[PDB]
Design an enzyme around this catalytic site. Sequence first.
Site, PDB file in Angstrom:
ATOM      1  N   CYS A 171      75.043   5.503   9.824  1.00  0.00           N
ATOM      2  CA  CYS A 171      74.130   6.320  10.635  1.00  0.00           C
ATOM      3  C   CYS A 171      72.685   5.797  10.690  1.00  0.00           C
ATOM      4  O   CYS A 171      71.989   5.744   9.671  1.00  0.00           O
ATOM      5  CB  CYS A 171      74.145   7.792  10.183  1.00  0.00           C
ATOM      6  SG  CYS A 171      73.138   8.896  11.236  1.00  0.00           S
ATOM      7  N   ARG A 215      69.310   8.645  10.007  1.00  0.00           N
ATOM      8  CA  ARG A 215      69.207   9.373   8.740  1.00  0.00           C
ATOM      9  C   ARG A 215      67.790   9.744   8.315  1.00  0.00           C
ATOM     10  O   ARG A 215      67.619  10.472   7.330  1.00  0.00           O
ATOM     11  CB  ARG A 215      69.926   8.630   7.610  1.00  0.00           C
ATOM     12  CG  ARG A 215      71.439   8.767   7.623  1.00  0.00           C
ATOM     13  CD  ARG A 215      72.065   7.915   6.525  1.00  0.00           C
ATOM     14  NE  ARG A 215      72.113   6.493   6.862  1.00  0.00           N
ATOM     15  CZ  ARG A 215      72.363   5.537   5.968  1.00  0.00           C
ATOM     16  NH1 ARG A 215      72.578   5.862   4.688  1.00  0.00           N
ATOM     17  NH2 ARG A 215      72.399   4.258   6.349  1.00  0.00           N
ATOM     18  N   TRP A 226      71.450  14.175  18.160  1.00  0.00           N
ATOM     19  CA  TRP A 226      71.137  13.835  19.533  1.00  0.00           C
ATOM     20  C   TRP A 226      71.477  12.369  19.731  1.00  0.00           C
ATOM     21  O   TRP A 226      71.608  11.632  18.755  1.00  0.00           O
ATOM     22  CB  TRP A 226      69.673  14.151  19.873  1.00  0.00           C
ATOM     23  CG  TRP A 226      68.661  13.553  18.947  1.00  0.00           C
ATOM     24  CD1 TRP A 226      68.205  12.260  18.949  1.00  0.00           C
ATOM     25  CD2 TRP A 226      67.941  14.228  17.908  1.00  0.00           C
ATOM     26  NE1 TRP A 226      67.254  12.089  17.963  1.00  0.00           N
ATOM     27  CE2 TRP A 226      67.077  13.283  17.308  1.00  0.00           C
ATOM     28  CE3 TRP A 226      67.943  15.542  17.422  1.00  0.00           C
ATOM     29  CZ2 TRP A 226      66.221  13.612  16.248  1.00  0.00           C
ATOM     30  CZ3 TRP A 226      67.098  15.869  16.368  1.00  0.00           C
ATOM     31  CH2 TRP A 226      66.247  14.908  15.793  1.00  0.00           C
ATOM     32  N   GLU A 272      74.239   4.337  22.938  1.00  0.00           N
ATOM     33  CA  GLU A 272      75.596   4.862  22.785  1.00  0.00           C
ATOM     34  C   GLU A 272      76.173   5.169  24.149  1.00  0.00           C
ATOM     35  O   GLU A 272      77.332   4.836  24.436  1.00  0.00           O
ATOM     36  CB  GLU A 272      75.586   6.150  21.962  1.00  0.00           C
ATOM     37  CG  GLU A 272      75.127   5.972  20.532  1.00  0.00           C
ATOM     38  CD  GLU A 272      75.072   7.300  19.807  1.00  0.00           C
ATOM     39  OE1 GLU A 272      76.159   7.855  19.517  1.00  0.00           O
ATOM     40  OE2 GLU A 272      73.950   7.797  19.557  1.00  0.00           O
TER      41      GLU A 272
HETATM   42  C1  HEM Z   1      69.756  13.547  14.698  1.00  0.00           C
HETATM   43  C2  HEM Z   1      69.923  12.458  15.451  1.00  0.00           C
HETATM   44  C3  HEM Z   1      71.000  11.385  15.137  1.00  0.00           C
HETATM   45  C4  HEM Z   1      71.013  10.156  15.660  1.00  0.00           C
HETATM   46  C5  HEM Z   1      69.951   9.598  16.635  1.00  0.00           C
HETATM   47  C6  HEM Z   1      72.163   9.441  15.134  1.00  0.00           C
HETATM   48  C7  HEM Z   1      72.545   8.142  15.426  1.00  0.00           C
HETATM   49  C8  HEM Z   1      73.796   7.584  15.157  1.00  0.00           C
HETATM   50  C9  HEM Z   1      74.407   6.433  15.795  1.00  0.00           C
HETATM   51  C10 HEM Z   1      73.791   5.597  16.943  1.00  0.00           C
HETATM   52  C11 HEM Z   1      75.587   6.217  15.204  1.00  0.00           C
HETATM   53  C12 HEM Z   1      76.604   5.134  15.584  1.00  0.00           C
HETATM   54  C13 HEM Z   1      77.676   5.953  16.290  1.00  0.00           C
HETATM   55  C14 HEM Z   1      78.510   5.143  17.246  1.00  0.00           C
HETATM   56  O1  HEM Z   1      78.161   3.950  17.494  1.00  0.00           O
HETATM   57  O2  HEM Z   1      79.526   5.723  17.750  1.00  0.00           O
HETATM   58  C15 HEM Z   1      75.799   7.234  14.189  1.00  0.00           C
HETATM   59  C16 HEM Z   1      76.888   7.367  13.344  1.00  0.00           C
HETATM   60  C17 HEM Z   1      77.098   8.352  12.396  1.00  0.00           C
HETATM   61  N1  HEM Z   1      76.303   9.472  12.167  1.00  0.00           N
HETATM   62 FE1  HEM Z   1      74.409   9.764  13.003  1.00  0.00          FE
HETATM   63  N2  HEM Z   1      72.838  10.305  14.287  1.00  0.00           N
HETATM   64  C18 HEM Z   1      72.155  11.511  14.265  1.00  0.00           C
HETATM   65  C19 HEM Z   1      72.538  12.633  13.548  1.00  0.00           C
HETATM   66  C20 HEM Z   1      73.583  12.732  12.653  1.00  0.00           C
HETATM   67  C21 HEM Z   1      74.011  13.932  11.956  1.00  0.00           C
HETATM   68  C22 HEM Z   1      73.375  15.323  12.158  1.00  0.00           C
HETATM   69  C23 HEM Z   1      75.052  13.604  11.174  1.00  0.00           C
HETATM   70  C24 HEM Z   1      75.868  14.502  10.210  1.00  0.00           C
HETATM   71  C25 HEM Z   1      75.400  15.658   9.716  1.00  0.00           C
HETATM   72  C26 HEM Z   1      75.287  12.177  11.332  1.00  0.00           C
HETATM   73  C27 HEM Z   1      76.254  11.441  10.688  1.00  0.00           C
HETATM   74  C28 HEM Z   1      76.815  10.268  11.137  1.00  0.00           C
HETATM   75  C29 HEM Z   1      78.025   9.671  10.620  1.00  0.00           C
HETATM   76  C30 HEM Z   1      78.960  10.180   9.485  1.00  0.00           C
HETATM   77  C31 HEM Z   1      78.201   8.396  11.452  1.00  0.00           C
HETATM   78  C32 HEM Z   1      79.351   7.394  11.317  1.00  0.00           C
HETATM   79  C33 HEM Z   1      80.468   7.857  12.247  1.00  0.00           C
HETATM   80  C34 HEM Z   1      81.566   6.832  12.179  1.00  0.00           C
HETATM   81  O3  HEM Z   1      81.620   6.105  11.148  1.00  0.00           O
HETATM   82  O4  HEM Z   1      82.373   6.753  13.151  1.00  0.00           O
HETATM   83  N3  HEM Z   1      74.378  11.691  12.239  1.00  0.00           N
HETATM   84  N4  HEM Z   1      74.672   8.025  14.183  1.00  0.00           N
HETATM   85  C1  LIG Z   2      87.925   8.428  16.586  1.00  0.00           C
HETATM   86  N1  LIG Z   2      86.916   7.929  17.538  1.00  0.00           N
HETATM   87  C2  LIG Z   2      85.676   7.563  16.823  1.00  0.00           C
HETATM   88  C3  LIG Z   2      84.483   8.213  17.500  1.00  0.00           C
HETATM   89  C4  LIG Z   2      83.215   8.109  16.918  1.00  0.00           C
HETATM   90  C5  LIG Z   2      82.122   8.717  17.542  1.00  0.00           C
HETATM   91  O1  LIG Z   2      80.847   8.646  17.038  1.00  0.00           O
HETATM   92  C6  LIG Z   2      80.568   8.801  15.653  1.00  0.00           C
HETATM   93  C7  LIG Z   2      79.246   9.524  15.587  1.00  0.00           C
HETATM   94  C8  LIG Z   2      78.973  10.383  14.529  1.00  0.00           C
HETATM   95  C9  LIG Z   2      77.753  11.047  14.488  1.00  0.00           C
HETATM   96  C10 LIG Z   2      76.800  10.851  15.484  1.00  0.00           C
HETATM   97  C11 LIG Z   2      75.582  11.518  15.417  1.00  0.00           C
HETATM   98  C12 LIG Z   2      74.667  11.301  16.441  1.00  0.00           C
HETATM   99  C13 LIG Z   2      74.964  10.428  17.488  1.00  0.00           C
HETATM  100  N2  LIG Z   2      74.049  10.215  18.474  1.00  0.00           N
HETATM  101  N3  LIG Z   2      76.157   9.787  17.521  1.00  0.00           N
HETATM  102  C14 LIG Z   2      77.075   9.984  16.543  1.00  0.00           C
HETATM  103  C15 LIG Z   2      78.301   9.324  16.596  1.00  0.00           C
HETATM  104  C16 LIG Z   2      82.302   9.407  18.732  1.00  0.00           C
HETATM  105  C17 LIG Z   2      83.556   9.519  19.312  1.00  0.00           C
HETATM  106  C18 LIG Z   2      84.648   8.919  18.695  1.00  0.00           C
HETATM  107 CL1  LIG Z   2      86.259   9.075  19.480  1.00  0.00          CL
END
Ligand code: HEM
Ligand SMILES: CNCc1cc(OCc2ccc3ccc(N)nc3c2)ccc1Cl
EC number: 1.14.13.39
Lengths: 405, 404
Positions: free
Chosen positions: B108, B111, B280, B285
């Site tokens: 993430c 964070r 958000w 993305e």
């Molecule tokens: C508040 C604004 C936030 C922004 C701008 C942000 C940004 C991002 C981005 C760009 C990714 C990569 C996701 C992708 O490429 O599909 C990501 C992944 C992730 N985010 Fe954040 N995020 C935010 C909030 C949060 C929140 C609120 C949570 C949980 C409470 C969180 C937990 C995670 C987790 C667990 C991943 C990894 C998901 C995976 O491995 O597929 N994020 N985030």
């Molecule tokens: C199983 N597919 C994986 C998958 C990951 C995805 O994103 C992970 C993810 C988790 C948390 C996020 C928080 C904020 C953000 N802007 N993107 C976030 C994206 C979204 C859709 C799918 Cl389908």
Amino acid sequence: GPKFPRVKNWELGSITYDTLCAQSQQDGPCTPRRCLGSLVLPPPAEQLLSQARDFINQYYSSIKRSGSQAHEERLQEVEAEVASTGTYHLRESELVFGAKQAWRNAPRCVGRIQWGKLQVFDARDCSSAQEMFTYICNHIKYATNRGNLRSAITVFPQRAPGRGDFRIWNSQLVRYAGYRQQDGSVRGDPANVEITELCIQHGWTPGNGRFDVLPLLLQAPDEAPELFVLPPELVLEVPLEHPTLEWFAALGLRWYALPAVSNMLLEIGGLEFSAAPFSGWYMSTEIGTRNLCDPHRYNILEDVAVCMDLDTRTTSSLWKDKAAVEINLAVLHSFQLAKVTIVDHHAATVSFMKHLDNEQKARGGCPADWAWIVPPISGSLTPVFHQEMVNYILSPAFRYQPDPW
Amino acid sequence: KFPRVKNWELGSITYDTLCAQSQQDGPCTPRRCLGSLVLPRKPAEQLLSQARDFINQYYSSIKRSGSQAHEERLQEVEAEVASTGTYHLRESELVFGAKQAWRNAPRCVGRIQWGKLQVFDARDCSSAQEMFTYICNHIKYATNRGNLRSAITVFPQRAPGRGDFRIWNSQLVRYAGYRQQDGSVRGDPANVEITELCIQHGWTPGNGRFDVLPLLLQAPDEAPELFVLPPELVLEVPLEHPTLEWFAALGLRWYALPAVSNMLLEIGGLEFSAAPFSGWYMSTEIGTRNLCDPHRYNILEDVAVCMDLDTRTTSSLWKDKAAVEINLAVLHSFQLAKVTIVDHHAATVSFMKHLDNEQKARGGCPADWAWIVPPISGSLTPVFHQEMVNYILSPAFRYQPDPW
Ligand code: HEM
Ligand SMILES: CNCc1cc(OCc2ccc3ccc(N)nc3c2)ccc1Cl
Ligand code: HEM
Ligand SMILES: CNCc1cc(OCc2ccc3ccc(N)nc3c2)ccc1Cl
Ligand SMILES: C[C@H](O)[C@H](O)[C@H]1CNc2nc(N)[nH]c(=O)c2N1
Ligand SMILES: C[C@H](O)[C@H](O)[C@H]1CNc2nc(N)[nH]c(=O)c2N1
Ligand SMILES: [Zn+2]
């Protein structure tokens, strides 16, 4: 099913298994507890022998004579040589195979589709710094080939017990000077400040341009390094202009044609070649994104953005992205106009995907460093981004080595 | 022992000591690094020790370690596990646990926001219908008329020998993907399977490129139920471009709320199989991955042609040019609609500050370089030049199998 790493391509949904990694005899920096994959930089006769035996086995396999009489005699010959001298020597064709296998094995190189096409210059007879310069000039001439670039490596004598190394002090054969200013800033290439000052300490009369080609610091065994100035006609450069933005040419930017790394150690069968410069051709992002736009390199992004009249006051204008794209386009356009070999990051990554498939069939895998393979702009726009990769060290190998000073 | 971590832009060096707190194996070994892989290949003393460790984390967080309350809480947990094989979290602990799991999420980039998370306790949920109500409120709260607020809703934990509560959809808002028999896909190809599951469970499908899917919600050991989200709950941004007047005519759009719903929340050994969370979007993305990936909406060529670019050759950088304009359009459009969004430069800059905050606070910060570095203009962002150490800390968000 299979007890080997499973590797997925998320664009195409295809699955492979890397069995090649089983052949790795050297550990990397990662453990089950933490992944250190993003880190840039993380003999006893018995050890030599097993490495040497492994390489000789590799060589005889590559020519389909594994288990043969000549195979077993070469093994006996290498052991006996180590038995009396503590080291051994490679046959010419073994050096050629090893040099190519080193390239083929390099996890960070996106250009490995070309691995079989490598001109190997044997320079293991070189016995002076002057002679090293001759060999290097010849390498540059051959490799440059008036712009129709050809991959090449020149191999100088191997590390020898009780004798100093052959070393090329410069990180590449062609490098721009970096002059530290009174105001703390840097004129030229900040990457090259240290070598520049080393050249000066060693009697070089410095220029004061942004693109002064550095002289070579060449070191023959147990001797002070000697200074050699490259004849400028040997050093092909490309002035940068843009296909449509007419002012771009007025920036006076340029880059050299030949990417010729010279500070890397070529290891083959436990033998160590401390000076073995090699060269290919550039991928356009190396020049256009990294060398020209890195904050700690030429850092020209703001200058270009201003010329493009972009809003540099806010991230959300994407002024950095826009400028970077046009700079990259300028590199490609200028190299093409000049008829000097270059490859864009799309063509290159496409060809690497082809390479991965070839190596899947030929060897059951291909060691690859995702962070280095994916280009520094337009990452997910290229196929390699969506390709999982297994990273591991195979030998023969190119290795980092400490600076001679 | 402790990894030396270098930033290559600034010359600065840290040492990660936080990684020694990792109790879970990642996929790498000395022989080979598997860091670029997306998904993992695959008693009561165990639970009790994860539980103690978490309660310890919690009481340290409120600066009451060794307090009678801390000691009494440890005995409570121990007594409950010894008797029932499991235990339950206090709301305040759950709130701490959820924030920590976000904080520990190596992938993430957002964070910096971790301490600011609205936590809805939905552990008093006994039906898919109740899950639906909670989900609607979550979306209402989180969306907040475009002024997005990060939130998580936590449904009842997993129990031994009982089906899980699950949200079948990968996100609360997803666009349908319809597989036309002529090979192609209309809509989002990432959602073909879920779209089809919806249809078979009784959803009358649309035939558009941006048809918002119904939710399939599942209470334990029951078939999932279908629920259509009230359109007024789902905020969407029509895409246009600040200078290219024709862009709006592409009919492109995307939803405001990125709300992932298929991840498992593990806290103190307890597992929450349905715990959707939202923040958000970072613009890449939508603009880069969702719209430009070849196996998603794949609009690059269309936009390029509209820009009259030379599609014939790679070396014209038509792909790079089109992608930049699409990302710009996403930023412009969200800004024009007053809907929260962050560009990848702002995002990565705040992440660097986060690394710094965390270095001082915890002695390190788990980060997955390949995911933190944005998908366009990688080396133009500071995170590209930052070495990172990846490892698993608990509380954690984890992947889990699809429930079908
Ligand atoms: C508040 C604004 C936030 C922004 C701008 C942000 C940004 C991002 C981005 C760009 C990714 C990569 C996701 C992708 O490429 O599909 C990501 C992944 C992730 N985010 Fe954040 N995020 C935010 C909030 C949060 C929140 C609120 C949570 C949980 C409470 C969180 C937990 C995670 C987790 C667990 C991943 C990894 C998901 C995976 O491995 O597929 N994020 N985030
Ligand atoms: C199983 N597919 C994986 C998958 C990951 C995805 O994103 C992970 C993810 C988790 C948390 C996020 C928080 C904020 C953000 N802007 N993107 C976030 C994206 C979204 C859709 C799918 Cl389908
Ligand atoms: C023929 C065209 C070639 C292309 C397009 C190419 C491309 C690249 C690129 C883009 C990199 C990343 C370098 C960086 O980001 O600094 C790289 C690294 C590397 N290349 Fe290739 N290369 C080519 C030829 C060669 C040859 C001929 C050799 C050796 C025989 C070679 C060996 C290596 C090695 C060892 C690295 C890793 C460098 C490091 O870790 O510092 N390449 N290559
Ligand atoms: C540790 N040395 C870092 C360093 C790497 C350098 O380049 C790596 C490198 C190595 C081989 C290459 C082969 C072809 C190519 N186009 N680029 C290539 C780039 C150049 C200078 C320095 Cl200082
Ligand atoms: C920290 C990070 O490993 C470092 O900046 C790497 C990332 N990927 C790279 N990739 C290439 N091709 N070349 C590089 O110099 C780097 N640098
Ligand atoms: C194969 C590779 O690991 C995969 O494409 C990863 C790379 N980095 C990523 N980074 C982010 N933010 N999101 C992703 O889905 C991915 N995918
Ligand atoms: Zn690793």
